[PDB]
Structure formats: structure tokens, C-alpha cells
């Protein structure tokens, strides 16, 4: 089900903008117990972002969750 992906997205978004920024992403990661540096966090975005905007959109979010 893709609901799992939507659920994860809902947990990531901190307002309902539909565009997960590095700040919101880091917030969730830190809450999970993952303490990474500025570079490490940005790297995650740089790999997920295919457009090259500086954030992860719904489409890219779905692809990253299905990555292998």
C-alpha cells in the first residue's frame, strides 16, 4: 500500500506544505535517535532530490522509500 508512504510523509511535514525541507527531515531523524551532522543530512537531501531544488517533494519521497 502507498498509504505507508503517505503516512511517513505526514509525519515528516511539520505544517502541511507538501515540501519536506532539511530542517523538518533532520527533526524527524533526531527524534528517532539519529544524530547526524549538517553535511550528512544535506547529503540525504542531495540524493533524494532529483530536480535539484534543495528539498524533497512527494514524488521524490515515494521513490526514495522504494529505493534499494
Amino acid at each position: 500500500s502507498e498509504e505507508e508512504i503517505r503516512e511517513a510523509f505526514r509525519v515528516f511535514d511539520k505544517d502541511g506544505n507538501g515540501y519536506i525541507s532539511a530542517a523538518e527531515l533532520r527533526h524527524v531523524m533526531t527524534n528517532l535517535g539519529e544524530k547526524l551532522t549538517d553535511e550528512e543530512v544535506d547529503e540525504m537531501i542531495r540524493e533524494a532530490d532529483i530536480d535539484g531544488d534543495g528539498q524533497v517533494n512527494y514524488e521524490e519521497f515515494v521513490q526514495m522509500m522504494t529505493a534499494k
Binding site: 505507508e4 528517532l32 522509500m65
Partner: peptide, 12 residues
Amino acid sequence: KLAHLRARLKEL
């Protein structure tokens, strides 16, 4: 990893 993230996220 991304897969591990979805796993732990579901735990909490």
C-alpha cells in the same frame, strides 16, 4: 538507511 527509517518510525 531509508528502509530502516520506515521500520523504526513505525515502532514509535
